[PDB]
Amino acid sequence: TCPFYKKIPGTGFTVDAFQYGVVEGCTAYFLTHFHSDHYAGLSKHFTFPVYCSEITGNLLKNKLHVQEQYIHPLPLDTECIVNGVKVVLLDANHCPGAVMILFYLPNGTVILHTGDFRADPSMERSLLADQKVHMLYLDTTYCSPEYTFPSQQEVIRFAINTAFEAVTLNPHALVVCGTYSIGKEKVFLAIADVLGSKVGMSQEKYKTLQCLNIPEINSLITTDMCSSLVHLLPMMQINFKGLQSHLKKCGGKYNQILAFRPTGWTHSNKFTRIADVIPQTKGNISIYGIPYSEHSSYLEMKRFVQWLKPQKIIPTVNVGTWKSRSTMEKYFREWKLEAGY
């Protein structure tokens, strides 16, 4: 049974609600982005209309084989009418194709659903600037003040400088980057670019990347592993055994691996600056955990919400425990009292 925080009142609409069977009274199913916890239940046998971005629609068609007749892609930043209701899709600054959705209810209520997002001050000059929002369905992933991490720009600067230094010292070092979903593509693209290489990967991952409208992509990726000195592997393989085994397969082309695990937040963020991050090393293998987040930090979240001044907030993440729920509701009230709405 579909939970309440996935239904939009006064509409026939649900958001990221594909794992509950046919939802009573749902006439349109919105998908905010192509991450498995959100698309869970879509497949080629789905026969209701799906509304989403062009990119998300590319992945539904090619990866999950959803039939074209049920995929309704919408352009960003454009007022659109769905089943008698005005909607706008906005960039969520999450993974490729990820959107927030503004719903203009027939009774005059305005609702913003963030999907997954990383709040940014640039959002204060989108189409959100122009009108009041009554209800906010908020990505509360890191809604607590211990959740700090650097900008994405700082993290990429660290990774490029690290990779470039290592490979310039040793031209026989291989760089490996972990992945388990879309998002965070800048990590491996930035490093390949500084090294003058293409990124090598499996056919299945290359296929996924060909759906994402990245400019000049045919210039940056390849399935020819032998022509590439940046390789992508599944995240699960980014450990000493997995990497040793990979290094065996490269046929004595390489004698060292430098590997990156982009995580979200880890507790080593409570102590160590990005500048000061160090790898775990065993022999000729080193592994760096880097905190590349595609969700709001606590401070970025707070600033967006205090700018927006919603009358009601409904969290969409960390909803399963009373302690989590109580924690979030305390922060929302602090924010409201400090800013005066």
Nearer to Ni ion, 277 or 317 (CB): 317
Minimum distance from CB of 36 to Ni ion (Å)?
9
Taking CB under 5 A as the binding criterion, the range among 13-21, 30-38, 186-194, 276-284 that sits at the site for Ni ion is 30-38
Q: Give the number of residues written for the chain.
A: 341
DSSP3 helix / strand / coil % (the chain, rounded to 5): 35, 20, 45
| Backbone dihedral region for residue 65 (phi beyond 0: left; psi -120 to 50: alpha; all else: beta) | left
319 Cβ contact list (under 8 Å, min separation 6): 5, 325
Report in angstroms how near the CB of residue 92 gets to Ni ion at its nearest: 9
Least distance between Ni ion and beta carbon 8 (Å): 19
Shortest distance, CB of residue 325 to Ni ion, whole angstroms? 21
35 belongs to the binding site for Ni ion (CB under 5 A): yes
Residue 141 or 228 having the CB closest to Ni ion: 141
Smallest gap from residue 2 Cβ to Ni ion (A): 19
Among residues 94 and 198, whose Cβ is nearest to Ni ion? 94
Residue among 57, 60, 102, 116 that touches Ni ion (CB under 5 A): 116
CB of 219 to Ni ion, least distance (A): 27
Segment contacting Ni ion by CB under 5 A, of 31-39, 64-72, 100-108, 121-129: 31-39
Query: Candidates 32-40, 166-174, 225-233, 320-328 — which segment interacts with Ni ion by CB under 5 A?
Result: 32-40
Q: Which is nearer to Ni ion, 115 or 200 (CB)?
A: 115
Instruction: Tell me the site size for Ni ion, rule CB under 5 A.
Output: 2
Q: Could you tell me if 192 and 328 are in contact, meaning their C-beta atoms sit under 8 angstroms apart?
A: no
Which stretch, 111-119, 160-168, 199-207, 217-225, contacts Ni ion (CB under 5 A)?
111-119
Tokens of 84: 């008698």
Only one of the segments 22-30, 33-41, 57-65, 321-329 lies at the binding site for Ni ion (rule: CB under 5 A); that segment is: 33-41
Least distance in Å: CB of 222 to Ni ion? 27
Draw the binding track, 277-296, toward Ni ion (x: CB under 5 A; -: no contact). --------------------
If the CB atoms of residues 18 and 254 are measured against Ni ion, the closer one turns out to be 18
Binding segment toward Ni ion, per CB under 5 A, in 44-52, 114-122, 246-254, 325-333: 114-122
In the bound complex, what is the minimum distance in angstroms from residue 35's beta carbon to Ni ion? 4
Residue 54 CA to residue 44 CA, distance in Å, equals 18
Asked if residue 139 binds Ni ion (CB under 5 A), the reply is: no
- What is the smallest separation between the CB atom of 293 and Ni ion, expressed in angstroms? 11
* Binding status of residue 113 toward Ni ion by CB under 5 A: no
Helical axes 203-210 vs 54-62, angle rounded to 10°:
150
| Contacts with Ni ion, residue ranges (CB under 5 A) | 35, 116
